[PDB]
Structure to design on (234 residues):
């Protein structure tokens, strides 16, 4: 499991929850409960972020939907769409309920997305 | 080439020269000339860093040896030893002649090293 390995490496290094999705669902979860995210449908926010192809960083999110329709209290998050041959095929998400995502995590998701693509 | 793919992803995302070595030589080079680094013997600094297992960040290096005996003018660099089963098997290096390596790159090498291990 290639996405799982990367998610684990990101968690081990950065210490924040890591999700990786394909076009539909989360396919890798590290740092968070697999029950909460694995195979769950990605949110409209994730879909839009992937469609827009650019990475995003929200330093003061307050609340976010990672799973569609599921409002979650969230301090911050960052998303790196995985774009292969111009087509979004997934995304890498790093988030925290209590810590602030910064350029470290923002670049981490871009790097992860680039490698996974 | 797995190390090459990661080095390329790191270069694409962070925009700095990236080297990956095994215990002996550089095995992947991105952002810099392959002639300057590929198959070149790693420096004593690299060997010591790997032996000590911890990542390092030098924000004001002035000069560094990446290739053994080769003094290179360098603004800054960061090194993430690749440690598998307690044994150092290589390292990921990000460096710049003109820009300052910070936590972004420092964590990038740790993440890279963790994944490659």
């Amino acid at each position: 499991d290639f996405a799982k390995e990367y998610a684990d490496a990101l968690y081990d290094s950065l210490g924040h929850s890591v999700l990786i999705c394909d076009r539909d669902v989360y396919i890798a979860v590290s740092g968070s409960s697999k029950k909460d995210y694995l195979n769950k449908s990605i949110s409209e926010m994730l879909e839009r972020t992937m469609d827009q192809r650019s990475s995003v960083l929200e330093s003061d999110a307050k609340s976010v939907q990672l799973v569609n329709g599921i409002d979650e209290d969230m301090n911050s998050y960052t998303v790196g769409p995985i774009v292969a041959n111009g087509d979004p095929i997934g995304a890498v998400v790093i988030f925290s309920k209590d810590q602030t995502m910064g350029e470290v995590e923002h670049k981490a998701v871009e790097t992860a997305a680039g490698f996974l693509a």
